[PDB]
Design a binder for these strands. Structure first.
Lengths: 63, 386, 136
RNA sequence: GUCAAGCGUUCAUAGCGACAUUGCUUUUUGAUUCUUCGAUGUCGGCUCUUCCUAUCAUACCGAAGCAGAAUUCGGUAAGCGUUGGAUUGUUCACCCACUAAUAGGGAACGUGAGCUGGGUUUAGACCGUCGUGAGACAGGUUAGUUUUACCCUACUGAUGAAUGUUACCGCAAUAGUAAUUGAACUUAGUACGAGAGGAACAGUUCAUUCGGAUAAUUGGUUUUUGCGGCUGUCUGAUCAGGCAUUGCCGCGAAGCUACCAUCCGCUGGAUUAUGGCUGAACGCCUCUAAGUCAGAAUCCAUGCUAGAACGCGGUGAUUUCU
RNA sequence: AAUGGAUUAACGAGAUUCCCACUGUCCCUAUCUACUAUCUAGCGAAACCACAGCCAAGGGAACGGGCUUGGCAGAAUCAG
RNA sequence: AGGAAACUCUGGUGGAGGCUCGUAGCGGUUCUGACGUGCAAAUCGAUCGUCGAAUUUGGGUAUAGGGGCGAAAGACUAAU
């Protein structure tokens, strides 16, 4: 087996836990949770969301 | 006049009456078929339903598409501390059925089981089985002959056992007590086996083994007085309807001028005895051991109890069971396990099972981490972590 | 499927009932597909037959070419938009639901496919695999 | 159903079966007017159960103008199932499509203190025809109040006196009962068939329908009024908060819940029809007469559900200065 | 064919058909909230009532709670 | 402003209509909702019609039973 990375939060997705999405352009996204999923459908930016790994690494926290 | 468009009986009538059980501990109606060629051993067990979780393994049915591929499966977990054998009774057979002629207990008893004899224990002399111990306190004064009576008679024997509700994390202190049939060897052997096992633990490593199909017998969760619509699966009547739509519209014809039993009706849902079968065991595991949650592939030392515990149960520090799928019964509840009655091979009951990974994540939410080590690793330190 | 069931199928959560209009993905001239029936469908009272991924169906064209329009035709689903569950527990869903015209045996009357499809359909209907760009 | 002129290449009976004839049913429609006019709520649909079989499909079988496939006839069989839609008030009909198959009927033409009120069936109104006219028309159209259960019974669930008391473990009378059908691969492009075409049993994986549980996962729900935010206004401003019939939004655990999710859904005997074994009557022969074998979705048990509250058993402890 | 005929823009809580959107009308139901029902304290009606209240078949005013023959029959009761 | 002229157009003002949206108000379509031994011998809710008038209304005043009144339903004429 393997573990993966939420498009939004960038989190380990242990098997089965979480949702998957396949846009018409064949981009396969994965979501650990409906929180991330709903934000994605809202077309939010994780780099702006604070608790996200992208914001974390863009503001240079936990270096 | 006839039914214009056909459709089947809503619900199942073998499972009637849909009424509250006689107990919080489902009766075991039937045990397997006794045979003598095997050794004396139990044919049932008792534990407490703890909860569910989810695992991973490699299927093997030669002809599927997930043959030799991974899957993920919902399992159910039971906490099965070893049951204390105390006593046995003897059943002689009549044209009026099996019938107990003797119940032999043991000398010494635990507060939990004689509490189960009592109701108001906190104000009690605790006077129970004292004169039984005084029938004991000698060599065999009035016990040896009961045993030999059971030998001379009693085609069937059932061993009395009780649980360790104090080993559980529960808050009851009132042990559960029950009988199990023995389906091995001869009758003298059964009784002397039990005599050896008076006041003695018995465990799941002895009663069961992996890849065994069993029956789960328990009482299904109570849902109160309920309408016909959830209780039977009847069509919700339409929007425009005076005086209720969560109903059955016609409940019978003019003639017979009575309500037929088969018609649906509101009333008790749940707290029902149920006996589900063909539940493959996937893992026995040990309280007196760590790494219960760790397969040969993971090898990350971790028990089965997730972060923050089982919801409404706690920990699994006793011997435990992981079985495929669901079972009748809710969390914190008793459960009566049972060997099968029939040598189902089917290339489904013989599918040998070896595991890969076991979700030990928090069910009190949407848990991302199986371990706080992993948690701190992913997160870094924290304000509280000085 | 039946006829063109190159093997079997595992159940898929059902989200395309009769009355559903779903996109057409192929190069056959169509724009939409009005589902009206399902093969291998169950027969229960006041239950709508529901299609799935891989389920061959009978459909109509409410929008498209006047050679295709006003006649039924077999069609096959490749996209669902309803979260179903594979044996690895992955809950997955597209954003749209679409299909492709076919013959009863399963060969696409159209020569190509425009977008992603489902691996189940790709494994069950080989001509779709032939005309597939991307699979999942 | 009887009979059988004829059809069926030839041949009455594989299958049909005119002319003639004997019966059955009450699901039509008449006929009658026994009950009912100090009122039995009146079509259909929806819902929901149950029953019959004159069996559409499924199980096992027999016959064929049955090579195979497909089909037709017939038997035990009502166990199990018999759809979604278009138009119509519709019953009915006709079409579309799936289907294993889309069989017919009964229960006060089941069912209105269960719905609805399209239709019919008051009063308003329009047309046509009839009528001098008021007015008439199972002729057409439109609009038109659908009441009460708190009683008894039945039903579902739920308690419960009395058995010397109380607690625990059990038995199991009786009643109920459930699992259903299809596809795909393989057998095998084999058998069979001149060719055309084209099987089957076993085996495997899957699904349909129904059921019984469960809530790890996903989804839903959210008064956790838990976190954050938003508008208006009030609290001098801030901080923090009230009101806005739960103010609104996003997230949202727990719990409940979903063929929208998951898991499970037993094997032995006696039998029918049918085919048979030995076997006479009838010195042969014959499945039958005595005896006897296998045999089905049947029947009964296994199993499962409740446990007789007036069915029973085993066991423990049984009150003192009362 | 002013017992008015044929059209007719605009208007219509008018009758009717179709398309777009929308949707728990529906597939197929689920969940939540307040008020009830529920239990309590207190208050406290009514309709209705031959007598009362278990089934089957029979016959009978041709569809019985009672009669006949059978089946059965175990205090008092709560919610629905 | 244009145009040969005939005369045509443009921007503004202005504030008409048995116009329109829509509150109060007068009403009463639909829900064939609630209630239907009611709060009520005709109401409650939401949705709706209309809202400067052929408007709504108080008070006085006239018309009385085979008579009256009626933008006409055999409607109203003190729950008739």
């Amino acid at each position: 087996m393997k573990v993966e990375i939420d498009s939004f939060s960038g989190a380990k997705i242990y098997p089965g836990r979480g949702t998957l999405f396949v846009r018409g352009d064949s981009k396969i996204f994965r979501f650990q949770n409906s929180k991330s999923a709903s934000l994605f459908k809202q077309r939010k930016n994780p780099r702006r969301i604070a608790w996200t790994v992208l914001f974390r690494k863009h503001h240079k926290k936990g270096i | 006049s006839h039914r214009k468009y056909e459709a089947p009986r809503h619900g199942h009538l073998g499972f009637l009456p849909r009424k509250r059980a006689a107990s919080i501990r489902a009766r075991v109606k039937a045990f397997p078929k006794d045979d003598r060629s095997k050794p004396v051993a139990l044919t049932s067990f008792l534990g407490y339903k703890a909860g569910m979780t989810t695992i991973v393994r490699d299927l093997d049915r030669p002809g599927s598409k997930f043959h030799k591929r991974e899957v993920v499966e919902a399992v159910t977990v039971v906490d099965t501390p070893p049951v204390v054998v105390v006593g046995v009774v003897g059943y002689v057979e009549t044209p009026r059925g099996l019938r107990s002629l003797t119940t032999v207990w043991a000398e010494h008893l635990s507060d939990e089981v004689k509490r189960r004899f009592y109701k108001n224990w906190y104000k009690s002399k605790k006077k129970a089985f004292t004169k039984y111990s005084a029938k004991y306190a000698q060599d065999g004064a009035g016990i040896e002959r009961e045993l030999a009576r059971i030998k001379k008679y009693a085609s069937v024997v059932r061993v009395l056992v009780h649980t360790q509700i104090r080993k559980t994390p529960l808050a009851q202190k009132k042990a559960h007590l029950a009988e199990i049939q023995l389906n091995g060897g001869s009758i003298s052997e059964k009784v002397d086996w039990a005599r050896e096992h008076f006041e003695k633990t018995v465990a799941v490593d002895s009663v069961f083994e992996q890849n065994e199909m069993i029956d789960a017998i328990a009482v299904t969760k109570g849902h109160g007085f309920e309408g016909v619509t959830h209780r039977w699966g009847t069509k919700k009547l339409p929007r425009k309807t005076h005086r209720g739509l969560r109903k059955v519209a016609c409940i019978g014809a003019w003639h017979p001028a009575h309500v037929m039993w088969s018609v649906a009706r509101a009333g008790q849902r749940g707290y029902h005895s149920r006996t589900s079968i063909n539940h493959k065991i996937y893992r026995v595991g040990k309280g007196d051991d760590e790494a219960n949650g760790a397969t040969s592939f993971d090898r990350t030392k971790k028990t089965i109890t997730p972060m923050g515990g089982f919801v409404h149960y706690g920990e699994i520090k006793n011997d435990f069971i992981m079985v495929k799928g669901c079972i009748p019964g809710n969390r914190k509840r008793i459960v009566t396990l049972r060997k099968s009655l029939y040598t189902n091979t089917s290339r489904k009951a013989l599918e040998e099972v070896s595991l890969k990974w076991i979700d030990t994540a928090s069910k009190f939410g949407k848990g991302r981490f199986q371990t706080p080590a992993e948690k701190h690793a992913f997160m870094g330190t924290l304000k509280k972590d000085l | 499927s039946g006829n063109g069931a190159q093997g079997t199928k595992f159940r898929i959560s059902l989200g395309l009932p009769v009355g559903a209009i779903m996109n057409c993905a192929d190069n056959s001239g169509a724009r939409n597909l009005y589902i009206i029936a399902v093969k291998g469908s169950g027969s229960r009272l006041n239950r709508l037959p529901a299609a799935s991924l891989g389920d061959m169906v009978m459909a109509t064209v409410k929008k498209g070419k006047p050679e295709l329009r006003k006649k039924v035709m077999p069609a096959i689903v490749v996209r669902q938009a309803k979260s179903w569950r594979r044996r690895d527990g992955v809950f997955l869903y597209f954003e749209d639901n679409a299909g492709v015209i076919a013959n009863p045996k399963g060969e696409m009357k159209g020569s190509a496919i425009t977008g992603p499809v489902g691996k189940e359909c790709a494994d069950l209907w080989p001509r779709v695999a032939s005309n597939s760009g991307v699979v999942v």
